[PDB]
């Protein structure tokens, strides 16, 4: 399970911390679950291009994060775009917001499992 | 949809928007629509390595565009392989060229 | 097919490139077959997270590598955690390695059909 923030943005680590952590808060919150095992990352990616424009922009991705829904979806990605558009000035009409769930399809392993 | 560049070569930021800027233009102009909504990116991976080589490569994942058939896609993957082994001196069997197919927000429903 | 190692441990080139061929040694190992199409990459993102925390975590992405199967998968991400906690001592428990196959799904070219 990942949120990723992929944005030709460019912010100082303790800020970037600080708005992952804010949006994990988001998604534990508006989905109701402890999201104890939750990756997340703030790629920043200069060149990025939406609409043929290297404008601000941030692209967000959540994958396989267990119990989004129609009743919660929407919330969840307005108060993700409130929280970019706060924290990075981006324009809300350059934020995109994608959920995609692929759990059933991959395998996935801890190390912890090896010793 | 996103047309994605993953490199290790460098090229200068404006070089890399004009490459992209190309692409886009191809991407456009071989599927014969326009590319309102696609992202794309030059993404610059100094350690990527194909067939055990760290040489010169760039991959090409084309996501989730619409239009994508047996007839328009290896036209596509030509120009291309062209406009990377123009802009990078990429050799054109060090490019490789995948597509793709794959709920969604904008952020302007929120503002 | 591809191999990527997403981690916020920061690691010179030279060791990056020693640890992802290792990497593909150990892939072409448990399959017995080679890996020569195989794409590798140390993918340095230093604001990754895993559960909240900001400490040194990798994350191995396998993807459409012909071979792995349940009845070997287990056994590749013994040795990948193996390797990873050797050279860059990540604790096994934030190491988690991901295998997705989507071999079947998309169309691919060689830019070497067009020129050379």
Redesign the interface.
Request: net charge positive; aromatic share 18%; with cysteine.
């Given at each position: 399970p990942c949120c990723e923030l992929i944005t030709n943005i460019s912010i100082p680590?303790d800020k970037?911390?600080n708005t992952?952590?804010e949006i994990?808060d988001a998604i534990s919150n508006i989905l109701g679950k402890p999201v104890?095992?939750?990756?997340?990352?703030?790629?920043y990616?200069?060149?990025?291009?939406?609409?043929?424009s290297?404008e601000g922009?941030?692209?967000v991705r959540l994958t396989s994060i267990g119990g989004?829904n129609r009743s919660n979806?929407?919330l969840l990605?307005?108060k993700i775009?409130?929280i970019?558009?706060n924290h990075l000035s981006?324009?809300?009409?350059?934020?995109?917001?994608?959920?995609?769930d692929?759990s059933a399809?991959?395998?996935?392993?801890?190390?912890?499992?090896?010793?």
């Open positions: 680590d970037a911390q992952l952590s994990e104890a095992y939750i990756m997340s990352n703030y790629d990616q200069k060149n990025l291009r939406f609409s043929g290297n922009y941030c692209f989004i979806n929407s990605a307005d775009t409130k970019l558009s981006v324009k809300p009409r350059r934020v995109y917001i994608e959920f995609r692929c399809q991959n395998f996935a392993f801890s190390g912890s499992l090896f010793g």
